[PDB]
């Protein structure tokens, strides 16, 4: 069987000896442990794949189980000699040796060339905690100033983004801080592989969600500015919240792919976080590219839609009084007229006769609305730009790096799962750069407001 299964069998039976009241029930738990230890001895741990069956690393691996079986047999002798508390004492020693001989070989853990000294130097739980507190305080501030500001689709997406950033920092931040406080010894926080896999799912979820929500904001702006105006309705707010839920569900489904067998979550340098494995295996390539293509496309789509929206706002919030066809969105521009249909440039919409129709869809003047300049639309366009700039600067270096690592001609990662120290050190840098998106998205909303500008112009 798999190492993880034998590991579970071992722990399940350790709690059994712990609760146990007689020698016979301690004996059965100890017998199951011996079979699980002998079973685990035959296993090939992924971090020893390139190593030959008779290599030093494999000899030390198989030897660990001789030590475990020897400790099981020492507790079995104690149980067969009727001594209950003596066999429970010798069995509790296996909780320490299971960490030495099983824990480090679990699928979470790839091989690393990090020393105990390098770990003591990087470990900074107070720096990390302070930095999370700043991020959470920023997101609580945005939510607070959003509460005092009604049924808009843009603010719905923005509220989704702030709640995602806040929660992201809280969940992943507390795992990061715990790992720094434990000097990156995962067994101290959670023995086994469960916390690591939870960390990975939640890293993808809170990595993809702000990016997808940023693209949702660019889409709302584009449809809102290009198509005729519609007063923020309860239905539009409802539709925007349903969309935030679909985005969250899509980001969650994506994070669950390694649990379904597409990709894999492993502990990453310095040992404070888990993420997709930057390997050359089919699943590592597919999941790594799926994550980077999804994030890349979100930022790219945001760029395309925002440039069209800014250009539309500029052209529309200047010049003569414009009118839009509330059927196709055609904008009657007095500067141009409609000369092929008798309207020379300069003709104000009011001077166009009753029997003129839209040159795009052919409906009458009755279907035309005045294009009204709203400061709120400018405020929202500025905020959508701020969010797009923040995701470009913070998320793109990481997204490009993931895709580049996963696609490297000679593989970036060894068969055992080892990356070079420079690859690990860069991944940490880009991951740290990406964290700032969760800290800065609330500030774009806090700072890019008319009230902030009105209280800055005289104070500058």
Ligand X SMILES: CC(C)CCC[C@@H](C)[C@H]1CC[C@H]2[C@@H]3CC=C4C[C@@H](O)CC[C@]4(C)[C@H]3CC[C@]12C
Ligand Y SMILES: O=C(O)CCn1c2c(c3ccccc31)C[C@H](NS(=O)(=O)c1ccc(F)cc1)CC2
Ligand Z SMILES: CCCCCCCC/C=C\CCCCCCCC(=O)OC[C@H](O)CO
248 binds ligand X (CB under 6 A): yes
323 binds Zn ion (CB under 5 A): no
234-255 vs 153-181: helix axis angle to the nearest 10? 30
Partner touching 249 among ligand Z, ligand Y, ligand X, none, CB below 5 to 8 Å by kind: ligand X
Residue among 97, 237, 307, 414 that touches ligand X (CB under 6 A): 237
Question: Minimal distance in Å, beta carbon 128 to ligand Y?
Answer: 4
**Residue with structure tokens 């993420």?**
275
Residue among 240, 274, 343, 439 that touches ligand Z (CB under 6 A): 240
Residue among 17, 102, 123, 176 that touches ligand Y (CB under 6 A): 176
Tokens of 172: 């992943």
Alpha helices in 45-124 (DSSP H): 56-80, 84-92, 94-101, 116-122
Q: How far is CA 317 from CA 85, 313, 336, 345, 380, in A?
A: 84, 6, 16, 19, 15
202 binds ligand Z (CB under 6 A): yes
Question: Minimal distance in Å, beta carbon 408 to ligand Y?
Answer: 21
Question: Minimal distance in Å, beta carbon 350 to Zn ion?
Answer: 18
Please answer whether residues 179 and 232 qualify as being in contact, where contact means their C-beta atoms are separated by less than 8 angstroms.
no
**Residue with structure tokens 């990090």?**
114
Tokens of 5: 């299964």
Alpha helices in 229-268 (DSSP H): 234-255, 257-260
Residue among 267, 406, 434, 444 that touches ligand Y (CB under 6 A): 434
Reference 352, options 334, 376, 375; nearest CA is 334
Residue among 36, 136, 199, 203 that touches ligand Y (CB under 6 A): 203
Tell me whether residue 27 or residue 264 sits nearer to ligand Z (CB atom): 264
Task: Please state, as a whole number, how many other Cβ atoms lie within 10 Å of the Cβ of residue 269.
Answer: 21
Residues near 422 by Cβ (< 8 Å), separated by ≥ 6? none
The partner residues of 268 in beta bridges, in order of sequence, read 273
Question: Minimal distance in Å, beta carbon 404 to ligand Y?
Answer: 17
238 binds ligand X (CB under 6 A): yes
Partner touching 172 among Zn ion, ligand Z, ligand Y, none, CB below 5 to 8 Å by kind: ligand Y
Residue among 200, 207, 279, 288 that touches ligand Y (CB under 6 A): 207
Tell me whether residue 2 or residue 66 sits nearer to ligand Z (CB atom): 2
Each as own residue / partner, the long-range contacts of residues 358-362 (CB below 8 Å, 24 or more positions apart, any chain) are 358/325, 358/327, 358/328, 358/330, 359/330, 360/325, 360/328, 360/330, 361/325, 361/327, 361/328, 361/330
Q: How far is CA 424 from CA 119, 137, 148, 268, 419, in A?
A: 14, 30, 44, 8, 7
Contact characters 295-324, ligand Z, x per CB under 6 A: --xx--x-----------------------
Question: Minimal distance in Å, beta carbon 214 to ligand Z?
Answer: 9
296 binds ligand Y (CB under 6 A): no
**Residue with structure tokens 């005729």?**
228
438 binds ligand Y (CB under 6 A): yes
Q: How far is CA 446 from CA 159, 286, 440, 451, 458, in A?
A: 12, 38, 10, 10, 19
249 binds ligand X (CB under 6 A): yes
Tell me whether residue 223 or residue 249 sits nearer to ligand X (CB atom): 249
With contacts defined by CB under 6 A, name the span among 242-250, 314-322, 346-354, 406-414 that binds ligand X. 242-250
Query: What is the gyration radius of the CA atoms in the chain, in angstroms?
Result: 30
> Which residues contact ligand Y by CB under 6 A?
128, 131-132, 168-169, 172-173, 176, 203, 206-207, 270, 272-273, 431-432, 434-435, 438
- What residues line the site for ligand X (CB under 6 A)? 234, 237-238, 241-242, 244-245, 248-249, 252
Can you give the binding site for ligand Z, defined by CB under 6 A? 153, 194, 197-198, 201-202, 212, 215-216, 219-220, 223-224, 236, 239-240, 243, 297-298, 301
């Amino acid at each position: 069987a798999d190492l993880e299964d034998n590991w579970e069998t071992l722990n399940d039976n350790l709690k059994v000896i712990e609760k146990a009241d007689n020698a016979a029930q301690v004996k059965d738990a100890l017998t199951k442990m011996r079979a699980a230890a002998l079973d685990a001895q035959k296993a090939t741990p992924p971090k020893l794949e390139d190593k030959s069956p008779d290599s030093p690393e494999m000899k030390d691996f198989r030897h660990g189980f001789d030590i475990l079986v020897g400790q099981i047999d020492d507790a079995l002798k104690l149980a067969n000699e009727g001594k209950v508390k003596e066999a429970q004492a010798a069995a509790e020693q296996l909780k320490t040796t299971r960490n030495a001989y099983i824990q480090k070989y679990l699928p979470c853990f790839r091989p690393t060339n990090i020393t105990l000294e390098e770990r003591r130097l990087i470990a900074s739980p107070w720096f990390a905690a302070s930095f999370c507190v700043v991020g959470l305080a920023s997101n609580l501030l945005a939510l607070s100033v959003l509460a005092g500001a009604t049924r808009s689709s843009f603010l719905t997406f923005l509220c989704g983004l702030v709640l995602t950033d806040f929660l992201g920092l809280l969940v992943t931040g507390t795992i990061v801080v715990s790992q720094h406080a434990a000097l990156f010894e995962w067994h101290a926080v959670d023995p086994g592989c469960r916390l690591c896999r939870f960390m990975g799912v939640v890293m993808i979820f809170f990595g993809l969600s702000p990016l997808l929500l940023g693209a949702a904001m660019a889409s709302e702006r584009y449809l809102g500015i290009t198509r005729p105006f519609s007063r923020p309705a309860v239905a539009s707010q409802r539709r925007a919240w349903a969309t935030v839920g679909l985005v969250w569900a899509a980001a969650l489904a994506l994070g669950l792919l390694p649990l379904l067998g597409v990709g894999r979550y492993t502990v990453q340098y310095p040992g404070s976080w888990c993420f997709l494995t930057l390997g050359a295996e089919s699943g590592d390539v597919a999941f790594g590219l799926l994550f980077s293509m999804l994030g890349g496309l979100s930022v790219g789509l945001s760029f395309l839609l925002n440039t069209v929206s800014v250009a539309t706002l500029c052209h529309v919030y200047h010049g003569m009084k414009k009118y839009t066809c509330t059927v196709c969105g055609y904008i009657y521009n007095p500067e141009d007229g409609d000369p092929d249909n008798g309207v020379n440039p300069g003709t104000d919409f009011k001077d166009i006769p009753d029997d003129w129709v839209c040159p795009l869809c052919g409906v009458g003047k009755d279907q035309f609305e005045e294009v009204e300049e709203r400061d709120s639309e400018v405020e929202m366009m500025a905020q959508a730009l701020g969010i797009m700039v923040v995701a470009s600067v913070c998320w793109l270096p990481l997204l490009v790096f993931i895709a580049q690592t996963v696609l490297r001609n000679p593989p970036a990662m060894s068969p055992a799962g080892q990356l070079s120290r420079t690859t690990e050190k860069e991944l940490l840098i880009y991951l740290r750069v990406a964290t700032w998106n969760q800290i800065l998205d609330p500030w774009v909303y806090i700072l890019f407001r008319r009230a902030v500008l009105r209280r800055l112009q005289p104070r500058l």
